[PDB]
Amino acid sequence: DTNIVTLTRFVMEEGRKARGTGEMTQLLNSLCTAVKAISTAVRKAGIAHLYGIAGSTNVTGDQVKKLDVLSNDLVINVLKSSFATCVLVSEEDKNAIIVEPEKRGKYVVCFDPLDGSSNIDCLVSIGTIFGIYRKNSTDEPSEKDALQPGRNLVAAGYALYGSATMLVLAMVNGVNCFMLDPAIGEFILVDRDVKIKKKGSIYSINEGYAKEFDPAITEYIQRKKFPPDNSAPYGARYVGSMVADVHRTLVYGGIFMYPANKKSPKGKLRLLYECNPMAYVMEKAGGLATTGKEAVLDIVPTDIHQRAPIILGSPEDVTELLEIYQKHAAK
Ligand SMILES: O=P(O)(O)OC[C@H]1O[C@](O)(CO)[C@@H](O)[C@@H]1O
Ligand SMILES: [Mg+2]
Ligand SMILES: [Mg+2]
Ligand SMILES: [Tl+]
Numbered sequence: 001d002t003n004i005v006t007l008t009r010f011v012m013e014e015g016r017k018a019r020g021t022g023e024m025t026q027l028l029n030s031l032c033t034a035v036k037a038i039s040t041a042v043r044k045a046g047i048a049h050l051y052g053i054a055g056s057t058n059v060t061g062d063q064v065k066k067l068d069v070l071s072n073d074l075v076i077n078v079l080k081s082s083f084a085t086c087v088l089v090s091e092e093d094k095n096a097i098i099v100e101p102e103k104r105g106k107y108v109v110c111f112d113p114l115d116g117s118s119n120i121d122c123l124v125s126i127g128t129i130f131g132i133y134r135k136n137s138t139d140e141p142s143e144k145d146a147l148q149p150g151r152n153l154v155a156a157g158y159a160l161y162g163s164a165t166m167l168v169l170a171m172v173n174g175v176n177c178f179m180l181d182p183a184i185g186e187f188i189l190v191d192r193d194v195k196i197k198k199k200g201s202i203y204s205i206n207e208g209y210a211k212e213f214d215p216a217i218t219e220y221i222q223r224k225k226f227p228p229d230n231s232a233p234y235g236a237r238y239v240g241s242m243v244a245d246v247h248r249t250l251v252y253g254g255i256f257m258y259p260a261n262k263k264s265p266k267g268k269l270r271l272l273y274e275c276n277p278m279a280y281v282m283e284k285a286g287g288l289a290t291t292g293k294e295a296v297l298d299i300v301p302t303d304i305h306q307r308a309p310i311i312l313g314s315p316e317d318v319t320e321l322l323e324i325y326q327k328h329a330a331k
């Protein structure tokens with residue numbers, strides 16, 4: 001009651017014995033501020049007329065919504081002001097953003113300011129995704145500082161604007177969930193050291209793409225619906241917002257899939273600010289995250305807006321699908 005374990009307190013105490021300049025706390029405190037401001041706009045978006053498009057398109061091809069602009073501006077401004085960052089990569093910006101010398105700190109942040117664009121207008125859960133790297137280079141900060149493999153992440157996670165607003169944060173020792181208290185505008189710890197189940201009973205994929213799926217995905221799905229051992233078939237869930245489907249995978253277990261297909265060699269989701277952050281969360285929770293052929297966190301990106309296939313969740317479910325890919329593997 002009068003001893004609130006806030007996100008700030010947790011990350012300060014975490015980074016205590018480990019020493020540190022304390023800019024990670026600065027960064028996350030700043031991010032939390034933009035997340036609250038996004039949550040409040042979202043929760044009254046119809047009244048504030050924030051539905052509808054902005055009138056523009058993303059890089060490879062994406063219709064930019066009003067809340068994309070708002071959330072993008074908020075995240076960039078708070079990150080800059082935090083004095084903790086030097087390079088920013090956003091889904092909404094064609095090029096990396098370089099922070100001004102005076103406000104530069106040591107971190108590189110890749111983010112999706114608003115994830116779940118197709119679900120905005122129907123009031124389904126949407127979110128914010130981020131991954132944070134330490135700049136390694138010694139030269140002037142540049143776009144290349146963002147082109148690190150996922151395994152180099154120091155922290156990653158997401159905000160979920162669902163039935164409640166939740167900040168899920170993964171760092172080297174594990175995953176923790178903080179719920180926004182709307183009364184005092186603080187993220188409070190509600191789930192400690194989260195670990196995903198070894199095996200789940202939900203599969204999550206858009207079967208609208210059945211016609212384009214590779215034979216391994218096709219086989220796996222058939223197996224969920226017609227188990228060979230007479231076990232009960234898996235239930236299906238696909239909210240359509242990566243943050244919502246991945247969060248459910250984390251807390252209920254199971255598998256989430258956005259694979260490569262006949263029209264999309266690399267899938268749809270973006271490696272730097274969608275796939276890597278979630279793969280990292282999953283791995284810190286004891287889960288797996290693969291493209292079907294390689295670990296997502298091991299990919300070395302060459303494009304900040306690069307796409308990747310992703311299959312993640314409970315280790316025994318992801319493994320079962322890898323076995324099918326392996327079985328189908330060819331010259
Ligand atoms: O409509 P589709 O192709 O299933 O795409 C849904 C995916 O697209 C995204 O909106 C990309 O931002 C994800 O949040 C989501 O998982
Ligand atoms: Mg977005
Ligand atoms: Mg997204
Ligand atoms: Tl977008």
Ligand SMILES: [Tl+]
Nearest residue numbers: 114115116117
């Ligand atoms: Tl969006």
Ligand SMILES: [Tl+]
Nearest residue numbers: 268269270274
């Ligand atoms: Tl995407």
Ligand SMILES: [Tl+]
Nearest residue numbers: 062091269270
């Ligand atoms: Tl995207």
